[PDB]
Amino acid sequence: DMYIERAGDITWEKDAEVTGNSPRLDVALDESGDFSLV
Amino acid sequence: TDGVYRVMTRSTQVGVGVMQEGVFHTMWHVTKGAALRSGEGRLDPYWGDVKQDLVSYCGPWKLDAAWDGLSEVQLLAVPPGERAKNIQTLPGIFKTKDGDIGAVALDYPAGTSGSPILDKCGRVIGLYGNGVVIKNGSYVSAITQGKRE
Ligand SMILES: N=C(N)NCC[C@@H]1NC(=O)Cc2cccc(c2)CNC(=O)CNC(=O)[C@H](NC(=N)N)CCCCNC(=O)[C@H](CCCCN)NC1=O
Predict the structure, then answer these.
(1) Is B2 in contact with A37 (Cβ distance < 8 A)?
(2) Which residue ranges have their beta carbon within 6 Å of ligand 1?
(3) Nearest residue of A to residue B41, measured between CA atoms
(4) How far apart are CA B69 and CA B107, in angstroms?
(5) B34 CA → ligand 1 middle, Å
(6) Do B10 and A1 touch (CB under 8 A)?
(7) Handedness of CA A1, B58, B76, B73 (dihedral sign)
(8) How many CA atoms lie within 13 A of A34 on its CB side?
(9) Separation in Å, CA of A15 to nearest CA in chain B
(10) Do strands B54-57 and B23-26 pair parallel, antiparallel, or not at all (unpaired)?
């Protein structure tokens, strides 16, 4: 039994917490949908 | 109705998706392309692509907004057992032989897969959860978007 349940509205939040870097990565994508690092 | 939804198996949250224009959008690895229940109703898989890791239910892919390649974005993360929260970030880039894809360096549990990534207008520019693990064990997700035909 795989089912869905509503979890909220889709809305941009003003003045939000900002985190994470902006990595520049060389990757490959295979036919099964898997990304890998080159 | 339109909104963000948890995808559950009976319970465990295995992912998240977006309802827009009567179509439910999630990542293929969340459902393996199988049918879903919504209340007493059944959602049938209509379109999908394992290489993109995407699937849509009840109709074709509807999400057509694209990352502008410049601006900060928000992950509307819906982690298992936690309410939806917005996390703003400046994407990095997956550079591939077929072009660049925006990517977010944000790390959440596996069942957060399918959470939408948003532009400043609140449009869904892609779904979170298909990515790579970098050397230190942290995670980077593509901003995975389908084609609205
Ligand atoms: N080509 C390949 N297989 N790339 C795989 C990339 C990546 N898979 C992993 O992170 C597996 C993994 C690897 C090491 C350690 C852990 C998990 C333990 N972590 C957790 O148990 C919670 N966190 C985590 O699982 C990840 N964070 C982390 N630091 N490892 C964040 C997962 C976010 C949601 N996405 C997924 O679950 C997909 C499913 C598979 C889609 C395939 N097409 N997953 C991924 O993309």
Answers:
(1) no
(2) A 33-36; B 29, 53, 107-110, 112-113, 129-133, 137-139
(3) A3
(4) 21
(5) 21
(6) yes
(7) positive
(8) 5
(9) 9
(10) antiparallel
Residues B39 and B75 in one domain: no
Same-domain pairing of B6 and B57: yes
| Residue B3 shares a structural domain with residue B22 | yes
Technique employed here was X-ray
Put simply, whether B76 touches A (Cβ < 8 Å) is yes
Q: Which of A2, A5, A10 sits opposite B76 (nearest CB)?
A: A10
Partner-chain contact B134 A32, CB within 8 Å = no
Q: Are residues B69 and B113 in the same domain?
A: yes
Domain check: are B45 and B24 in the same one? yes
Name the residue range of residue B125's domain.
64-148
Asked which of B63, B89, B112 is the last residue of a domain, the reply is B63
User: B31 and B15: one domain?
Assistant: yes
Last residue of a domain, one of B45, B63, B81: B63
The catalytic residue among B25, B56, B113, B115 is: B113
Resolution in A: 1.4
B52 and B78 both lie in a single domain: no
Total of domains in chain B = 2
- Chain centroid to CA A13: how far? 17
